[PDB]
Design a protein around this ligand. Sequence first.
Ligand SMILES: CCC[C@H](C)C1(CC)C(=O)NC(=S)NC1=O
Ligand SMILES: CCC[C@H](C)C1(CC)C(=O)NC(=S)NC1=O
Lengths: 168, 168, 168, 168
Amino acid sequence: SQIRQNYSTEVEAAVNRLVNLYLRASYTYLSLGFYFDRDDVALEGVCHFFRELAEEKREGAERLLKMQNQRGGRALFQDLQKPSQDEWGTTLDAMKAAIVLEKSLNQALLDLHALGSAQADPHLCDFLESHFLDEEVKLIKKMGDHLTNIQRLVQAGLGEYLFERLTL
Amino acid sequence: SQIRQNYSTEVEAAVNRLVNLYLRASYTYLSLGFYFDRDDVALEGVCHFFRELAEEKREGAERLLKMQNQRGGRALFQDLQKPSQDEWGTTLDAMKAAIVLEKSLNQALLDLHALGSAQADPHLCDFLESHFLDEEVKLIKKMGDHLTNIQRLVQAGLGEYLFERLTL
Amino acid sequence: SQIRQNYSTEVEAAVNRLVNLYLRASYTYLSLGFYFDRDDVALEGVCHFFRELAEEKREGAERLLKMQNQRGGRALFQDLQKPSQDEWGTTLDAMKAAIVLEKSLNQALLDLHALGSAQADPHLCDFLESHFLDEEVKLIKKMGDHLTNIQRLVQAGLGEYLFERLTL
Amino acid sequence: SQIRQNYSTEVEAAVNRLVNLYLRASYTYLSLGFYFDRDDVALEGVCHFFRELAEEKREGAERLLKMQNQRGGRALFQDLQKPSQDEWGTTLDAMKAAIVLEKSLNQALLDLHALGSAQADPHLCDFLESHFLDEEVKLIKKMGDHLTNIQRLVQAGLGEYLFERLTL
Ligand SMILES: CCC[C@H](C)C1(CC)C(=O)NC(=S)NC1=O
Ligand SMILES: CCC[C@H](C)C1(CC)C(=O)NC(=S)NC1=O
């Protein structure tokens, strides 16, 4: 590539993997969103919460793809694995699964940052810090807060309704 | 009729029956609405929900009557049977009865559509699809969502109050 | 399902398959979009054209999922297969592949409509006609128009630049 | 210096060198700009492109000088070497020379960042990342895109005119 400079093949490949992880995360949130839209689940606040997260992860993937091109790397796409569950249980179950997912994304980000540091790639490191690392930390804090409130509310049916109405 | 074209006597009669069904549905919702306005029931959100549905069914009947005339059919009215209950019990009972009513209207619509198809009456078929079929599907989904939330809330008295305050 | 009415297991499954097809189409357009964003391809008008299509297909999938829930069907997700190519060649190659993709989506829509008709499911048939069938016909006409203009322009390099600047 | 803290003599000197590089880059773009303003070259879009870059590099130098003072370093200026060419040939030649220049600036930035990291000077590292590293990456991507389009257009005279009219 005519523009490629200080961009290692290792980082390029790791960025492609992280794109796949973000798209897969988006797909998972899509599934979570429509599960709470089921007539036998019917928690619209929860549905909206997860659908918004699907959009955020998709946007994250697109930002990574833009950066890949800006650096002269080449986007390579793989199959997107279907979400790990077909039915997501209670709001509590769903939020626990969401925090597990975000922590795995966060760890992938931290791994990529470490790689960037080892390759002496400051543009990559700054890119991750500015657009991804703090966003993940804030989202995980929010999920933790939600989990704590859901747990304190669980009269389980009553608690789930009130959380959806008054928080989400 | 000078304007009548491709409008079978079978469809004409079925449309008159569907008008009666919609007016009867409107009357039922009128009764449901005023039951929840009783001082010993006193659930204003529920009262408003059903009164709005009474207006919707009445409007549906008028749209059918307009179409009957547009096609050159002749409106024939029958007695409107009084609603099946004088007292409607809990919000849960009422919502269950409402979904039963809507499914019966929906089935009458599907039957009429089938008749239209067999008579090769595309104007009728399009009319039902554009103004009735999707409206019914959306209303039934909403009722299902309500039923699910009411059920998860039923501290029965507390649940009924919260649903009325926070959803309706 | 408490709300499910006149919704066959066959249609439910076919809708799930069509969701997968739309998500896969969205993924393909995502890949096409970022290919034209490469510094060694650099056709921004083409990139934007395909990225907008990615968004349209994704929205189509979400509308299908909403309808699945409205009817009381159950969304089931499968792996999304990666796009059929990693590199998409010229604008001409890409547009040809795009029209092939849209025709396959269109055929899946026509198959589903035929299924709906055979199952006597007028809500499904109306849903497809109102939101999908005409959109596909219009998009395919537009692509055909583009293909014809690209072809008349192909001084191949010059033609590709002018099309991107003056049409897209 | 009363304010100087954690600012090594090595970084101070490297910053002075980078100021010289940016001023020299500004001077080069000034020359490129006025070459395309010649009546026997006459490509106003190209002239404007390079004149804007002259202003950007000059601003970059001033930001470095401001930072030097903020840290308690002492600005030292050297002769500015005249640009490497008096005449810049075709738009293609000029854009190639521009990308070579930007890559050399980028490498100087990466070297300075590496120095900062080795000296444990996080303020310097953050300063470069926030104001210089991403700007360079974006500018180099843009130049690569331009080069690719110029190349696809080169009927050389015709191609050069169209690029100037329709892109710049
Ligand atoms: C908002 C969900 C997006 C969706 C899950 C998905 C991946 C399947 C995505 O992340 N991005 C695009 S472009 N299309 C898609 O279908
Ligand atoms: C816009 C060009 C600026 C110009 C080349 C130059 C260096 C010669 C510069 O970069 N900055 C200042 S203050 N004066 C100058 O003459």
